[PDB]
Design a protein around this nucleic acid. Sequence first.
DNA 1: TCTGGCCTAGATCT
DNA 2: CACGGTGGATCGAAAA
DNA 3: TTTTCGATCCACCGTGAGATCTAGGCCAGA
DNA 4: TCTGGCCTAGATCT
DNA 5: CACGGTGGATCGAAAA
DNA 6: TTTTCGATCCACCGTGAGATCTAGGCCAGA
Lengths: 480, 480
Amino acid sequence: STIFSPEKALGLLLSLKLSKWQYITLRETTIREGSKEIYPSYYKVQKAKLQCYPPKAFVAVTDSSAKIALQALLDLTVNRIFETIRSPDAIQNKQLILISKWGFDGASNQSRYKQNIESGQGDSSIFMTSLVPLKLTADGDTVWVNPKPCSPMYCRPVQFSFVKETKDVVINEKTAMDDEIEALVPSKCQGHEISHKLMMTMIDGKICTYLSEAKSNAACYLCLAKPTEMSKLDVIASKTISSGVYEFGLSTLHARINVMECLLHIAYRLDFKKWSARGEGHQELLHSRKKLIQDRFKDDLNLLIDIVKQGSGTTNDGNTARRFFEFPDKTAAITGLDEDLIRRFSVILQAITSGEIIDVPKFKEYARTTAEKYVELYDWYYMSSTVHKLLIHGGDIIAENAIVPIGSLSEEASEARNKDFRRFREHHSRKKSRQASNEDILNMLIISSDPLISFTRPKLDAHKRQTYFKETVELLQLQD
Amino acid sequence: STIFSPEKALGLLLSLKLSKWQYITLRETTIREGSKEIYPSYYKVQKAKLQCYPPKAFVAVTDSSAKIALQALLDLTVNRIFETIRSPDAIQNKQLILISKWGFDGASNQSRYKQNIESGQGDSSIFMTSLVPLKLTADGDTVWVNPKPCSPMYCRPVQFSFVKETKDVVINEKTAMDDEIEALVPSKCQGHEISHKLMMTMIDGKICTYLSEAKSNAACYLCLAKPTEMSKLDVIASKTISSGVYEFGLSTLHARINVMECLLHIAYRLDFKKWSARGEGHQELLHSRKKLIQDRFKDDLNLLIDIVKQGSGTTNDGNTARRFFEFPDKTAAITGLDEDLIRRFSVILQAITSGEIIDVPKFKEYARTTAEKYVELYDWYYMSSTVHKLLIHGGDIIAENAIVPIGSLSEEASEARNKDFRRFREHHSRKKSRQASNEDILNMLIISSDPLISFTRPKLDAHKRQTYFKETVELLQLQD
DNA sequence: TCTGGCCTAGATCT
DNA sequence: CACGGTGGATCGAAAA
DNA sequence: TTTTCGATCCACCGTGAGATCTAGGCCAGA
DNA sequence: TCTGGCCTAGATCT
DNA sequence: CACGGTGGATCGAAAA
DNA sequence: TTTTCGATCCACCGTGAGATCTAGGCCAGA
Ligand SMILES: [Ca+2]
Ligand SMILES: [Ca+2]
Ligand SMILES: [Ca+2]
Ligand SMILES: [Ca+2]
């Protein structure tokens, strides 16, 4: 009978990102201020945590890894979803279907601990698998949808491991997860049996190369084609599609960074205009024109292209992407590239990120007309894997993965969770053991995406909408 | 007339490390819980901040740097100190004297912003100057002392700059600061004129090499001697001391890390036992015995020596230092080094870190007997600069800097503030400009060490005491 | 019969 | 021995 | 009899992050 | 009159 | 258009 | 008349970080 609810207390706890001691200090000092009641003790909020946590039968924490069985998280998370429905019984008493997306990531530059010398690699680099429910329908009848399908707040962990990314472990855990998905059953809740269909789409093309039968990463995994032969419409329109590889849905993240890098590469090569920078002087010309365009781009648009000495081109990620697209005329003047074509890239990126249904005939029309205008303008550079996958293969996988609007299917949401992971591991863990820290990060991320608390917790929305482009809204199949 | 005081509200704000929006959300949700009063608005707490902030006449924030005049912070901070006295008038109505320590640091691996291309270096590496009051006395009559002279909570900023460490800027800002110290006046407060004596001791020997007239860093800056000639007692006991170089007081931080590294170097060289690892096979012997001792040290003491690829030997910092010293018999057995000598190193490190007065005759006795036992045991390795400065020069600078108990004079406190700096710059800044972020970090660190709030704010003390060593407490001049 | 010049390569502390 | 911290397991003791 | 609630301890964690003289080789060398 | 072998150096995406 | 955020300047309007 | 207090917007920031096939040279070459 205190002022706050224990569910509201746990939601505020994780919304403010407070610690246990921090909470006892706040509560004891507020009682010291003289209001006899103000909060539940941490005992009550850990009892509320005990409502969020999956059964011990399916959790597995170790010194060096942890996992959970898939079905157990589906049953738990959909149980938590039934209370989010305004009345889980006043819905029609029929089977429902959860369409979910899942995937995984390797992230590096992790803090190294001084404990538990345990043989495997130490703690060099994190690798985690994760899942998120997008949509519940009974024949298209949306009973629940994520209000923010792109927020990290809804990504739920399936496993994590302190191992660097490698095609070996990548294929092993992929095929094992696929088997576990085939070995899953519709969940049950108080007389409701709900099917679950999963899409392994929350994955970068950079791992899809391992999940595809292409030795190169520069070969389009949907084409199985070389960059030289990539520049033709007909031969790739006359190529078959590999087995279920549309499950590798459109990775909206890398497409934009690859667009930025390929357009900068072209801006460098406007001197000699050959795909490869191999040749005579073209290296010195590249060095010169790259430095010149970095300085004339910085002085007018106030950005610095980031530096890496272990090796990597840049981190343009999100902000350089959107800033580069905010007024494309700016880079069109500085680099001297056509503004129409970057407006087409804006149109398609906006259509992909909108999060709504897209008419595939108009999309395929604009994509092939963009391929036309590209090759007639800049042929000599072989377009990257992702921009070819966009122009030729995109409409096909859009029509395949049309059961959910694209942009809700994304990895940007899940890989942003690594931001939480590090901050979870540093603040909210108990550091007396690696196994303890692994239990901490497990339960902390399960609370971080407890759907009911994720519904009733603090958030900020003032970023509601922004100016869509005219050819985009022509392309946009927007209804409401 | 709300429940919390605005000073208590600001102290809780910065104790919990909350944001402005986080505070409005907490307060509005707590009013939404129905207790009509609970906190002052952020308006009240920014008015309380306006009490902490130094006058605009002496602050200087820029796009790329910021500073404050020294006298202005002394006058402000001692003004804040007068309220910490139980009754600033019931003290004897006489002049007081603040003995303070100060210094600076360069720290790297800083987050790079995408804004304000401003010419100088970008934001590659931070360099900040800082000060802290230790002690107020009127002829030894302690009227105030820091209860925790080693906590970062009392370090106060004097300037900061986005420039990498370099002997040039180091000497320029050193000499300028020294001039500004000579150009300072005793503060005034409501009929009390208080003198201020500063010690530039919060600095590593690694910068003291620039502040000393020694081209080498491996040459002892107090000796001005070579490592070969460093191994003699008499010739260095017969060497004069440079001008005021005792102001470069005992850097307790690097002494312990250098002890760890030099003892590991000796553990490697137990095969051939020559100072330099130059020679025939000694390289292969070093590689082998280093790997072997890393593995036999890890498997029993559960530690991993950290890796650096830009270049650096290790980061043993604090935890590897104290863990290595907790049961020295462990490393004595694994490396095969004498336990007595590492017990002597423990005794002297414990005496330095105790924070209390030390009898210099007994200290000089034990230090020269440690030099004897070292050279008779391990002569062939030339002891490092810092361990020589300890054994020969330490008692001299202890008797010089005896006006304050050593260990309160330290840099570990100030350089831990870089932990706050990064976390201050990422969370609590406003990111609309570099100049805005520099104002944020300025005022945030001034609040982080507002002495009155630093007194009345949450903290944790259960780490009160631990087992001193017997020869130490023999050496320890401990009274109370 | 053994000090100096050149350097110099490769150890040295963050 | 720098020190301000890290959540869970447990004691125990007092409410309930 | 069970719940709750504070205290307690556990085994560490983050903050210390580009240039250098000098030990020695060698080479002559009368 | 123009495909293959060797490689190979130097572009390629994080 | 990812989204959860960043303190100050200002409006305004309601206490005081 | 001044203070206070919520809302608001500003111009962005952190989270995406070691191995590769293939384009082309060349070299012969009957
Ligand atoms: Ca990643
Ligand atoms: Ca990746
Ligand atoms: Ca530093
Ligand atoms: Ca240093």
